[PDB]
Symmetry: D2
Subunit: 387 residues, 4 copies
């Protein structure tokens, strides 16, 4: 029996430095996440604040950023880290994506030196948690239509609106909030203790239950001009953040896929029915071959994109190739794997249903499958088809 990674030949196309980072994160996941995750997911509650500190002190927050206590690792090493985190759980990887590639990235890329120096080192250590308030109840795929507004009042700004589906929102110390102004989209560094700001936890989730997801109500929150991100002057600012986060998801989704594929492979060799291992039936082999193919193609695509990113050669339409492909192929792998487990596959004895349900959120967030199709389509044709 050859495992999927062995059959694909993954280690041989990575460096020793990359493999070391991957191995380090895998060990963190096996030790600190996997023993608890079934319970956190079932309960829909996790010690998010304590976990952020743990992960930050381990060097896992802001991994792809430079300075301020961050790891400054390569795009490929960061990708491998995300893959390992998500093999643990997509909710856990989501906490990390929002912290580093959304909230910290926004401050790193568009913030004043005062904002960077105030927030980034404590965010890298996990002692202060961020969130990224873009989506609203009525505006998700079309953030250009956002209705949260920032209006001037003397030297201050007044922020009024509601953000929805905001990861980490209820446990966040700081919110990077996007708003429309009379001169275009702007972003603000919003301490969550500011009067007028409330965060409400979303309950009854059937996906991403080991993550905090919130409504943010900005009920006329008054901020000084110094709270504005000076470098953010258009919708392109939040979109640059999304493209950073999307890259991590390109790798991350493959971790959930891998965990499911490995589960199905092991089960197909151990479980017998009709006097042979179920892996000895053609219909089982078809599934295992198909899943291994999409995992391997997805990994080679992710690695290619990461190598391009490190070389400085990576556009949003290229990231969209990876995001469109790897998330939908991952969720199909999870679904197929569950069928191989039969009834055993319907409980948290195995990770497959958790992965499959989690991947519903990953499929939708950071641009739906349709959004990525249209981004790629526009690149290929020169014609937008969003409207």
């Amino acid at each position: 029996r050859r495992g999927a990674d062995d059959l694909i030949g993954i280690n041989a196309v990575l460096s020793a430095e990359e493999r070391e980072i991957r191995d380090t994160v895998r060990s963190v996941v096996q030790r600190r996440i996997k023993p608890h995750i079934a319970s956190w997911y079932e309960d829909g509650e996790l010690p998010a604040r304590e976990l952020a500190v743990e992960l930050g002190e381990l060097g896992l927050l802001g991994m792809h950023l430079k300075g301020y206590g961050c790891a400054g690792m390569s795009a490929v090493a960061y990708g491998l880290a995300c893959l390992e985190l998500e093999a643990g759980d997509s909710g856990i990887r989501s906490l990390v994506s929002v912290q580093g590639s959304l909230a910290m990235y926004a401050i790193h890329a568009f913030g004043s030196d005062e904002q960077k120096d105030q927030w980034l080192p404590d965010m890298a250590s996990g002692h202060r948690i961020g969130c990224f308030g873009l989506t609203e109840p009525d505006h998700g795929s079309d953030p250009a239509g956002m209705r949260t507004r920032a209006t001037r009042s003397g030297d201050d700004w007044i922020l009024t609106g509601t953000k929805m589906w905001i990861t980490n929102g209820s446990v966040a110390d700081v919110a990077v909030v996007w708003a429309r102004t009379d001169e275009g989209i702007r972003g603000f560094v919003v301490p969550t203790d500011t009067p007028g700001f409330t965060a409400n936890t979303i309950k009854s989730k059937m996906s991403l239950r080991a993550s905090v997801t919130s409504e943010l109500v900005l009920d006329g929150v008054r901020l000084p001009d110094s709270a504005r991100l000076p470098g953010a002057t258009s919708l392109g600012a939040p979109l640059r953040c999304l493209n950073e986060a999307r890259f991590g998801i390109v790798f991350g989704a493959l971790g959930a896929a891998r965990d499911c594929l490995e589960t199905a492979l092991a089960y197909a060799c151990s479980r017998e029915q009709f006097d042979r291992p179920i892996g000895g039936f053609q219909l089982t082999q078809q599934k295992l071959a198909d899943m291994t193919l999409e995992y391997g193609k997805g990994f080679l695509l992710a690695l290619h994109l990461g190598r391009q990113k490190d070389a400085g050669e990576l556009a949003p339409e290229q990231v969209s190739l990876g995001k469109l492909n790897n998330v939908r192929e991952a969720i199909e792998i999870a679904r197929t794997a569950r069928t191989v487990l039969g009834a055993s596959g319907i409980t948290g004895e195995y990770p497959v249903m958790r992965h499959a349900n989690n991947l519903e959120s990953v499929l939708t967030y950071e641009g739906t499958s349709e959004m990525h199709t249209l981004i790629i389509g526009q690149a290929l044709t020169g014609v937008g088809a969003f409207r």
Copy 2:
């Protein structure tokens, strides 16, 4: 806007009697199931005993059986009832399938007059709950390999083994248990208070959470010969029961599909993005068209099979056409529908994730997709390919 049933033209191919039964069950579901189901599913607990009484007193237990207080309705009317029940929830329809088409059916078909007279009227009223113990930890798709044994001891039988994944097991008054004997497979009517018999509820389910699913331990349970089902003399007896239950699932799965499709259709007309209803985008219309097609083809297949069943013309390989097709197409409808809802689709605000997760169990139980493929294949070729 035309709804899916209107576009397909369903009412015109049903009788007034059939439509009345359908409407009656729909009203029961809307009144007695839908207001509570989100909570029952989340909690993984429901008042199963009280619900059985409610459903029985409403005429909904043993619907397709004749006599003993049962409705004696046609195959088509029974199918429509199952569709409505499952549009409520597959777990609820499962409680009903096990009660009527498995446990009562077995007694009705193979029982002595003493067994029928003792058990069936109280089962039809819901005052006594049954379960059907075929599957074991190591034998599911291949029940011919079952290892639960029944051995003679004087005039008594001693039953020893474990059954697993048994719907209603922990709340059952009576268990119809299948065992191997020196002269072939036999079935027994096992009061669950018999010494040596225990039932343990399976927890941590990610599917069918509004149903009771159990392990049955038969630790040398001593029964008189009068507990044996006299008419059951081979594996064909439990298989006849499965074919009755499978028929109800052929219709039932379409109810979960319908509920999801209707949800997606309504949302596509109400939700706007990029300044139009999302139903005004081609990619949305593709989904809605594809889902409506598979729902309608699945319904026409179910109706055809039901008409054959009423005419006396329905073989197991024909039932397998419906079971193979309608469950996998239903789960694909649920999955696709969830994508149309975006983030809103990930909570129990909408029924789609519950339906999709429930359908995992329906896909596996009563013969997996692979089993039905091989049943149809053997019919088409004359050659078995199970081994």
Copy 3:
């Protein structure tokens, strides 16, 4: 071994009258089409004029029309006839569709009594061949944009434009030609000997090679006002004709599917590999089950639509369900069947490649898959998404 029709149970849902018509057409196909079709297809040439006479004298032209020597058969019987014709070859069924459901239908529905009396009886006998000139080089899916014009000159009309992909065009005696005028779309009965009218046969076809497909050049063709179809006053006139033809295709495509499925079933039982019939392998059974399911669902959909049509209950969006589904599922059946035949499947020893290539034209013509998706989508949502 049960054949697909036997497993589905088709004869039991048809009348004796319907079965008789079906059987009669099957015999015509077996005797007059199947012995020659491989040669006609390879050559890309067939005795179309002689064949039209044969088919007309057999009662097969204008089958669903009433009067003028036409059969006046039901929608269901007509459908079954089309299925049998296409099981022979889609090109042959195309000749018939254009003759009856397009060219004759247009005259029957919108013509003057003079036009009907002049043309229809000789068209029903096959002694005069029609064609239906809607599509142009630059306008296919959007016939509202057609640029062929009809302009008044005294009491005459002058028709100027080019029609393209016109079945029967080079062998037609009469062309029903659609044109834009200052008062909307109009249709004309155009004798093909009219000065200025030329028809050029399209060559190098890789599909529908046993059909004549042509360019029509109307180079200022002068016609009296009596050539205008008086009842045709908008784009809805040619669209009504298309909806008649589409209905026949709903059934027709299933004939090509059936022929391929039957071929694969027979081969799977006869061909041995690895010491068993290839039908004894699970992967083969998967294909045979899947194909049989889509054939049967497609047939039940077609029959349902035909029963609605006879009852007067059939809208264009309902026809589109059948056209969208049955053509794409038929072509997938043909493709899958070819794989079962291995190398033997690549020559005209078997009909599968001819059917698969023919179905490319059927998938595109009478509204592409995308057009039908959007017709169904608009019906479901109330919102057009063509633009």
Copy 4:
């Protein structure tokens, strides 16, 4: 507008040497193959002998072999060459695959020095054409079951049997023929002028029409022992040859895909319907995105396998990943591309139907999709499921 190769970023992961070879072969294809291929394919006839000389003198026969006038290029460069050849036509690439990776390879790997010195330089120049006789009428996927026999007669061998579907057979000077003997499978270098040897061209092909495909009849062909390949002592010998040829197909199939994708991309930008380029509709963009993804994933898989092959790290189950994936994804690309062209796509004005029909043979030969599934399955599970 970004082309597919540009969007994927292919040149940046190749060397200048690799790009030069690719470019050289592309120019040969554009100049010597593309102007004639529509006619050769339609006619089912090509100047195969003259073409072999042309290709050999250009260095394109035996590209991956060392010595004897062969190019000795890397696995990656050879792959790129095959991709370019097949973008021309799969039939043409097939002539090359059989010449180099089957017939020459067999002699190179298992032949005596006398055989190598006699045959290989004239095969590399194209002045002598080879074929590879493994498949028989009744044994294709299971060559272990072959019935062509070689029996000893004094110091001679007598070869008796029929080989079928043999590329280049009717134009071959030499046939590498596999036979069963009393001591296992053996291979023979068979001059085609040997008495008793006849080759018959297979006609009525609907695929690979620009290739010669033949029946070989070995009617008691008498050969000296020196005709035996000394190094071939089991079924593993012909299988090693297949694994060499399969590798070239992993790349080759992507060339047919590319040509189709490029065709669809150009057409989507040029063709207007409903007042916009058809590439401006969402359903068109979905197709273009999906095709580009599978082309790019397939290319990254091929390149990965080629890099492994050059490093000495490439097993048959790894080759099977590429063969299974790239051929079925290529044929799906061709099919999808044809739909984008509408009616224009059904003639040889565009290359898509030729590519799609050619790929039917590529899907089947060198191991069917099912064979590759089972090779991968056995590697993953340790259990064979062929029987």
